[PDB]
Symmetry: C3
Subunit: 186 residues, 3 copies
């Protein structure tokens, strides 16, 4: 919907940093179905060590941090330009000021409790949609674990892709789409 969908738009421009600024295209759509958020995620590297995959990396990580109002923190690895409520296949003209209804519930997934089993959704996605090339995806809710002397978030969602033990050298890091849901804050 419009106010019920917070997304990166369906076909985003490079909008996130896996290793270098805007080195990847993250497609993330959060659809509010009341108490739970229905999400679909996919990622594609466009430059750097993941395009194509080199021998120095066997995982990629992205941490999205939000303030108490569900707004992206200033030093976000996800570019804020096209992260907004939906309007057709694009986004609202003006930046949202509140998206708490899309945030991961703090009672279900307490802050810093990323080690807690429940705060993690773990599954396999596939490189280039190829069934013979599995990649483990671990989604952690409100795990954050602030990077020492930095600015703390109220909420966070982290994506961790791991292909340890596989030789995908020279393949472009691109994953199949994956669906998951989580309990909303309100």
């Amino acid at each position: 919907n419009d106010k019920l969908t917070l997304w990166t738009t369906p076909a985003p421009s490079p909008n996130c940093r896996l290793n270098a600024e805007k080195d990847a295209k993250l497609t993330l759509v959060l659809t509010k179905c009341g108490s739970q958020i229905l999400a679909t995620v996919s990622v594609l590297a466009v430059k750097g060590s993941l395009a194509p995959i080199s021998g120095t990396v066997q995982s990629a990580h992205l941490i999205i941090r939000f303030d108490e109002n569900g707004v992206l923190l200033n030093n976000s690895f996800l570019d804020p330009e096209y992260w907004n409520f939906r309007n057709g296949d694009l986004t609202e003209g003006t930046a949202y000021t509140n998206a708490v209804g899309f945030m991961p519930n703090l009672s279900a997934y307490p802050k810093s409790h990323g080690k807690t089993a429940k705060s993690n959704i773990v599954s396999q996605v596939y490189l280039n949609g190829d069934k013979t090339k599995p990649v483990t995806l671990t989604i952690t809710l409100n795990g954050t674990q602030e990077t020492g002397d930095t600015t703390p978030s109220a909420y966070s969602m982290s994506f961790s892709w791991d292909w340890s033990g596989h030789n995908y050298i020279n393949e472009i890091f691109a994953t199949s789409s994956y669906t998951f849901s989580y309990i909303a804050q309100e």
Copy 2:
């Protein structure tokens, strides 16, 4: 819902062609949750080479094609009789004329881009719901790839089940239920 649910009904009669006309029962329910469609799919072969599985087949495929209005194309492998909006545990008496809101988004999954990682959802389902008998399911959105000199679709959803490397000879091809979501066209 009624207009928010497009389905095969919950307990369909043979309604699709995996190899021969009406040789399988496809249960597919598309529930519209605004920007995303929540879906559940299951299939069961009722006759032919998949009931029971013989030695000449190690995969099964079904391609559903729709026109610009989200209506099934005339030569559909899915029988149109019970493919309609919901009414209780059955379908509306009259054939729908528009279901674009249930179609896979053309910006997220551009036509012919079935090779694109993002247009694919890949996971494992289980034969007869048995954890020891995995079957890989690859769902491709708007991949279509028109069969040469034929009639082109505006949208498509294809299901590909593969059990290469497994000996399921003499087992009936029937899968466990699987949930997935995708970005809607509107």
Copy 3:
């Protein structure tokens, strides 16, 4: 939502019996999206043979039974105290009398047909959210299979976790969160 969400609350107290009374915390949220119910489930053992896992058990099972009105049967392995419609991060003050809209559809998943492939959703969850410790989860809808001379249910949902072949002795039985959907009765 409120009346569209039937849950255990997001951070429940010990509320279910895997082996002994209240030996586990089951977090189960059922969100109604019309024709389908979107669900997220997670479990954590707090005492007994699963906290930590001993050598006499390689699986855990929980069967939730409901009457014709979608109300928990009296001898429920799930404690009824905090199983109700949502109100913030808690539950309605008074016990619900009808939740048929959250029950698994009897046409899609006929009673006693738990052996039927379609009535089963099978996937892998991970112990302590650790990708190296898979646990198979089999969810069976309306399988029930009444325990001989007892009281029969109109609907049921059973969860079966199995780690046969793995040595998780001394690990606490706690799983990552998992999302699934099923066709609602109405």
